Amino acid sequence: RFLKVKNWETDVVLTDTLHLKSTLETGCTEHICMGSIMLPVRTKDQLFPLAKEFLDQYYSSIKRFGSKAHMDRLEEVNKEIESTSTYQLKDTELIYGAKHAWRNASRCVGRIQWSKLQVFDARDCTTAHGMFNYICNHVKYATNKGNLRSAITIFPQRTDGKHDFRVWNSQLIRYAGYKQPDGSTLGDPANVQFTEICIQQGWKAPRGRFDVLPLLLQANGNDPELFQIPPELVLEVPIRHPKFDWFKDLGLKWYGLPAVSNMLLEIGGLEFSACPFSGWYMGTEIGVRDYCDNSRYNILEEVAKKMDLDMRKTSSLWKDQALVEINIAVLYSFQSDKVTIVDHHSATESFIKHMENEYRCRGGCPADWVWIVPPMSGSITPVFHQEMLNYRLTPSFEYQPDPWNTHVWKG
Amino acid sequence: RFLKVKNWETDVVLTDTLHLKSTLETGCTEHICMGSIMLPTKDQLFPLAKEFLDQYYSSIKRFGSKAHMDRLEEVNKEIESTSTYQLKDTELIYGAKHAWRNASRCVGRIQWSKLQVFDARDCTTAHGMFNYICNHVKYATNKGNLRSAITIFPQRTDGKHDFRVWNSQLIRYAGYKQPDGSTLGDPANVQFTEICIQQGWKAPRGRFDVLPLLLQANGNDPELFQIPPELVLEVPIRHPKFDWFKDLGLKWYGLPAVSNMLLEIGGLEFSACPFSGWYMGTEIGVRDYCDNSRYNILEEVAKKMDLDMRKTSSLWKDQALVEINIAVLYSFQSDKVTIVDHHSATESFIKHMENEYRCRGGCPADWVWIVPPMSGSITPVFHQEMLNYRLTPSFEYQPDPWNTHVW
Numbered sequence: 001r002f003l004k005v006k007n008w009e010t011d012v013v014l015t016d017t018l019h020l021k022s023t024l025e026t027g028c029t030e031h032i033c034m035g036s037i038m039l040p041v042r043t044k045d046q047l048f049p050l051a052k053e054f055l056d057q058y059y060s061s062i063k064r065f066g067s068k069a070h071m072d073r074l075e076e077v078n079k080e081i082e083s084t085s086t087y088q089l090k091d092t093e094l095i096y097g098a099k100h101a102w103r104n105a106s107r108c109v110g111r112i113q114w115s116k117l118q119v120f121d122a123r124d125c126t127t128a129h130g131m132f133n134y135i136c137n138h139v140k141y142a143t144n145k146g147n148l149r150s151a152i153t154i155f156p157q158r159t160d161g162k163h164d165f166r167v168w169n170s171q172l173i174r175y176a177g178y179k180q181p182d183g184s185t186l187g188d189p190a191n192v193q194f195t196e197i198c199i200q201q202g203w204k205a206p207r208g209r210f211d212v213l214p215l216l217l218q219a220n221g222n223d224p225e226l227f228q229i230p231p232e233l234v235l236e237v238p239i240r241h242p243k244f245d246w247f248k249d250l251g252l253k254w255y256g257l258p259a260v261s262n263m264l265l266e267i268g269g270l271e272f273s274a275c276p277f278s279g280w281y282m283g284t285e286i287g288v289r290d291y292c293d294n295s296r297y298n299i300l301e302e303v304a305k306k307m308d309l310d311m312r313k314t315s316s317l318w319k320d321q322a323l324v325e326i327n328i329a330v331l332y333s334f335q336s337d338k339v340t341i342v343d344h345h346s347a348t349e350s351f352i353k354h355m356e357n358e359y360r361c362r363g364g365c366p367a368d369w370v371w372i373v374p375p376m377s378g379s380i381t382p383v384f385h386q387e388m389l390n391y392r393l394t395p396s397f398e399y400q401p402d403p404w405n406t407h408v409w410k411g
Numbered sequence: 412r413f414l415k416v417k418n419w420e421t422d423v424v425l426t427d428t429l430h431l432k433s434t435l436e437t438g439c440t441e442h443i444c445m446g447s448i449m450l451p452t453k454d455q456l457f458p459l460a461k462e463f464l465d466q467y468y469s470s471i472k473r474f475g476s477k478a479h480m481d482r483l484e485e486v487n488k489e490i491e492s493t494s495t496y497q498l499k500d501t502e503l504i505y506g507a508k509h510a511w512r513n514a515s516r517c518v519g520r521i522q523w524s525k526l527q528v529f530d531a532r533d534c535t536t537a538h539g540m541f542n543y544i545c546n547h548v549k550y551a552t553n554k555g556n557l558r559s560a561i562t563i564f565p566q567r568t569d570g571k572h573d574f575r576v577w578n579s580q581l582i583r584y585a586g587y588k589q590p591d592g593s594t595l596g597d598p599a600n601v602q603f604t605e606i607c608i609q610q611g612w613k614a615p616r617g618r619f620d621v622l623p624l625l626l627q628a629n630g631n632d633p634e635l636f637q638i639p640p641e642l643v644l645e646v647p648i649r650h651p652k653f654d655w656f657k658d659l660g661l662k663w664y665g666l667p668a669v670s671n672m673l674l675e676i677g678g679l680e681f682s683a684c685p686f687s688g689w690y691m692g693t694e695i696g697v698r699d700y701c702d703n704s705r706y707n708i709l710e711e712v713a714k715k716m717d718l719d720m721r722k723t724s725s726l727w728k729d730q731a732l733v734e735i736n737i738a739v740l741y742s743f744q745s746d747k748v749t750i751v752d753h754h755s756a757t758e759s760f761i762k763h764m765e766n767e768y769r770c771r772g773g774c775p776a777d778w779v780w781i782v783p784p785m786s787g788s789i790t791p792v793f794h795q796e797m798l799n800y801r802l803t804p805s806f807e808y809q810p811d812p813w814n815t816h817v818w
């Protein structure tokens with residue numbers, strides 16, 4: 001079957017056949033759409049089909065489908081599953097798998113970049129100390145003094161579910177949040193619970209507005225351990241505004257490297273529970289969400305005060321006006337310091353070109369509109385007007401529950 | 412089967428049970444979400460009538476009463492005899508208000524219960540339709556203090572005698588393609604304008620020409636009528652800080668009035684049912700003015716602001732966008748024509764959602780349409796999970812009649 005998507009601005013129509021390869025479920029049915037719902041130990045049993053399907057894809061991509069090398073590899077994996085109950089990916093397969101999980105990430109606007117991903121194989125890692133070292137090297141390589149390079153580091157896969165490698169931080173680099181006795185929050189309100197765990201584990205909290213959190217690292221199902229990332233490895237950008245000289249005195253800064261560390265990477269039925277990956281920011285992630293969400297740094301009021309906007313009625317659009325100024329400041333600041341960043345116009349335009357290319361060469365591009373459309377200036381970006389089909393392909397990145405909810409403490 | 416929706420800003424979790432009463436299909440499956448696609452006989456009719464009357468008599472606390480049973484009986488007899496049936500006035504009013512109540516893409520639903528329903532089921536000609544519509548327009552406009560209304564023409568019979576308003580809204584501006592190659596006026600309305608000209612309309616060929624109505628009665632060929640100019644309230648667009656803004660020559664009309672949809676109540680189909688409320692500012696300022704395929708004015712405004720248009724990263728588009736939207740709200744407010752800003756509308760919808768969950772066990776909502784086309788995440792709807800499902804009575808899209816009309 002064929003499915004059509006139309007762009008309502010250009011009348012361009014595309015035809016999806018890739019959705020036919022989708023196995024995993026969406027959350028939706030014929031009677032309910034769950035498109036705005038944020039969150040909608042395997043047996044050999046299910047494992048060999050998952051392995052086979054993955055290896056068929058891999059061998060197709062390298063133009064060796066049905067070869068002796070292909071057949072031998074299936075055989076080899078089959079026997080390994082039957083006798084050890086799991087199997088090991090070749091380096092080539094791991095790299096291909098990691099690239100494809102990104103390619104398949106329907107909520108990711110940055111996918112034009114998917115084929116340039118540095119894959120760091122950390123499957124020989126055995127301890128939390130070992131994890132720390134790997135992660136420092138990733139941060140340094142990815143940061144590259146401001147000329148950011150995409151990377152992922154892949155720690156050993158799940159075995160029985162009792163020996164998981166996990167990075168407890170949601171992102172490698174994030175600022176602490178402290179709930180005060182008066183109910184106010186100092187620093188990032190999003191990281192309060194994790195900061196408390198760090199403190200509980202013995203972190204000495206400086207208790208400022210922008211304190212880089214320590215890494216909390218679990219190897220082999222053991223209790224996690226604290227490590228401070230070397231500060232000289234943590235590139236940060238002080239935020240200033242090209243015309244508003246008082247903007248610097250708000251005291252804002254952000255880190256340059258966005259690096260997700262709480263997701264689970266699935267390749268050929270294998271589960272990599274610790275697989276931190278990083279790219280570079282789109283300005284709105286910081287300027288719209290991080291700074292302006294009510295539940296985050298929430299700076300809109302202070303910014304609009306300083307601009308002396310009429311704040312007595314929402315219909316003056318003071319929030320909107322201040323929102324634009326903050327986002328200009330972020331882009332200006334990253335640019336002035338030569339730290340890679342992309343604005344939402346350029347990013348969404350690139351995504352549209354990527355998506356059209358994917359339809360032509362691959363037969364589709366699963367995309368989640370709710371996430372792809374930026375959180376400001378929606379309809380002046382080309383993605384707003386683009387129909388999108390959301391479905392789940394493997395390899396994939398999956399959400400997993402926070403480790404402090406599931407971890408069996410050894411003490 | 413019982414479903415939670417969470418607000419990620421406030422942590423409020425609501426439980427939806429109303430979706431279980433959903434009847435129509437979504438476009439989605441277990442394998443594919445189509446959340447972003449714009450357009451995804453006697454036997455069938457008695458179930459539809461029963462379902463409706465059951466909810467009606469339930470709503471007036473008379474479920475299972477003799478009056479309930481008697482009406483089921485009466486409607487039942489009428490269908491078997493006549494292959495259709497007629498709504499009581501009370502049922503028509505209830506049905507219309509609920510179609511709006513169930514409109515998952517409408518942010519304005521806190522208002523659903525205050526809808527003036529004009530029963531035009533006695534209308535027989537296109538001249539009658541025209542009279543009904545001017546009365547609706549005058550009533551709704553109310554000298555700028557807008558009031559929600561719907562006018563309901565006779566229901567579908569055998570499908571060859573449909574009442575249809577050919578216009579997509581009661582009030583729209585004409586569009587004309589130039590020898591120049593560009594477009595004068597509203598590019599969205601070019602095809603319809605051609606049909607008007609080809610039906611006989613003498614076009615002024617200006618930038619802001621209110622289109623005539625093209626009214627179809629009883630399946631007959633449609634006819635042209637101009638809405639009295641004095642009933643079409645328009646607003647010149649100025650900016651409270653930029654003196655030059657008015658020089659752009661922009662205006663918009665006060666009355667948003669959708670005329671192309673199909674109202675379905677208890678199996679019955681009202682193919683002509685123009686309805687109207689008042690604008691949310693972004694509809695005009697963001698979509699009408701700034702869509703590339705619409706009036707597309709961002710470039711011109713940004714130049715008058717003398718912004719650095721060299722690189723997308725100066726955010727010149729976003730800057731001019733906010734300003735155009737400030738001008739829309741200011742101009743409507745100054746002329747005392749009802750308008751709502753996206754902040755206030757989305758706040759009211761969150762309150763409405765809470766009421767509906769509390770009072771009805773849910774509220775179907777389409778996040779893709781509810782979240783405003785600018786400043787998404789600074790409105791509370793952005794952080795609000797929504798379940799989208801189809802309830803009846805309902806407003807449905809229907810195909811442009813010129814594609815269907817045999818002359």
Ligand code: HEM
Pocket residue numbers: 102105107108109110111113117150151152263277278279280281282285342347371397
């Ligand atoms: C190259 C620069 C990149 C840019 C500009 C980019 C852009 C984005 C943005 C704006 C989001 C939404 C994030 C949010 O709203 O919090 C996102 C989500 C995502 N991105 Fe990308 N991205 C990039 C690289 C990557 C890389 C290298 C990977 C993995 C290898 C990746 C995988 C994802 C995944 C899995 C999500 C969804 C996250 C979630 O559900 O929380 N991204 N990206």
Ligand code: HEM
Pocket residue numbers: 511514516517518519520522526559560561672686687688689690691694751756780806
């Ligand atoms: C009271 C003032 C009202 C406001 C501020 C309001 C707000 C809106 C907005 C912003 C949209 C999105 C439309 C678009 O983006 O083009 C919408 C869609 C809708 N509204 Fe409301 N509305 C109001 C009154 C009504 C009334 C009185 C009805 C019916 C009686 C109604 C039924 C609908 C329907 C069916 C849609 C979707 C239209 C479509 O799918 O094309 N609206 N409304």
Ligand SMILES: Cc1cc(N)nc(CCc2cccc([C@@H](N)Cc3cc(C)cc(N)n3)c2)c1
Pocket residue numbers: 038039110171258259260277278279280281282285399
């Ligand atoms: C409940 C829940 C579920 C879910 N799936 N995600 C969340 C939080 C979403 C989130 C929060 C912070 C950073 C990012 C990165 N996606 C931010 C990021 C990462 C990369 C690699 C590049 C880039 N430009 N940006 C995503 C919450």
Ligand SMILES: Cc1cc(N)nc(CCc2cccc([C@@H](N)Cc3cc(C)cc(N)n3)c2)c1
Pocket residue numbers: 449450519580667668669686687688689690691694808
């Ligand atoms: C293909 C297609 C499908 C579909 N369902 N809708 C469209 C056009 C969408 C549209 C266009 C103009 C006006 C409105 C009114 N919905 C605008 C409106 C109406 C009312 C009553 C109040 C208000 N504030 N605003 C909606 C196209």
Ligand SMILES: C[C@H](O)[C@H](O)[C@H]1CNc2nc(N)[nH]c(=O)c2N1
Pocket residue numbers: 035036037038370371372419793794795796797
């Ligand atoms: C409830 C809703 O799905 C939630 O607020 C989503 C909406 N769209 C998003 N889009 C992006 N890119 N990131 C997000 O965190 C969200 N949050």
Ligand SMILES: C[C@H](O)[C@H](O)[C@H]1CNc2nc(N)[nH]c(=O)c2N1
Pocket residue numbers: 008384385386387388446447448449779780781
């Ligand atoms: C492709 C996408 O469905 C389309 O652009 C939608 C997105 N959201 C919308 N939301 C509203 N309110 N109105 C619209 O016309 C649209 N257009």
Ligand SMILES: [Zn+2]
Pocket residue numbers: 028032033034035439440443444445446
């Ligand atoms: Zn869906």
